[PDB]
């Protein structure tokens, strides 16, 4: 498949805030959720991701949170 998405600055899944960039998926920017959701079982062994940093589109100003 080719005709589809081009490359949003946010997660290619939710499009809220991408914090990772999959090289195996054509540099597809993913988040810490959608990614660890599916990109945690497949042959990710090759899908080398990187700490992508967009134009602070949907960034946050707080420390660590749980819950
Ligand atoms: Zn996402
Ligand atoms: Zn991938």
From Swiss-Prot:
Which cystines does this chain contain?
none
Source superkingdom: Eukaryota
List the transmembrane segments: none
Q: Where in the cell is it found?
A: Cytoplasm, Cytoskeleton, Microtubule organizing center, Centrosome; Cleavage furrow; Midbody, Midbody ring
The record's note on quaternary structure and interaction partners says: Interacts (via MIM1-B) with VPS4A; interaction takes place at the midbody ring following cytokinesis checkpoint activation.
What is recorded about the protein's domains? The FYVE-type zinc finger mediates binding to phosphatidylinositol-3-phosphate (PtdIns(3)P). The MIM1-B motif mediates interaction with VPS4A.
Q: What does this protein do?
A: Key regulator of abscission step in cytokinesis: part of the cytokinesis checkpoint, a process required to delay abscission to prevent both premature resolution of intercellular chromosome bridges and accumulation of DNA damage. Together with CHMP4C, required to retain abscission-competent VPS4 (VPS4A and/or VPS4B) at the midbody ring until abscission checkpoint signaling is terminated at late cytokinesis. Deactivation of AURKB results in dephosphorylation of CHMP4C followed by its dissociation from ZFYVE19/ANCHR and VPS4 and subsequent abscission.
- Protein's name in the database: Abscission/NoCut checkpoint regulator
Name of the gene this protein is made from = Zfyve19
List the range of the whole protein covered here.
336 to 389 of 389
């Amino acid at each position: 498949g080719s005709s589809g998405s081009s490359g949003l600055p946010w997660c290619c899944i939710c499009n809220e805030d991408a914090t990772l960039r999959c090289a195996g998926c054509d540099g597809d920017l993913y988040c810490a959720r959608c990614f660890r959701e599916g990109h945690d079982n497949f042959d990710l062994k090759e899908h080398q991701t990187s700490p992508y940093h967009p134009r602070r589109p949907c960034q946050e100003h707080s420390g660590p949170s749980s819950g």
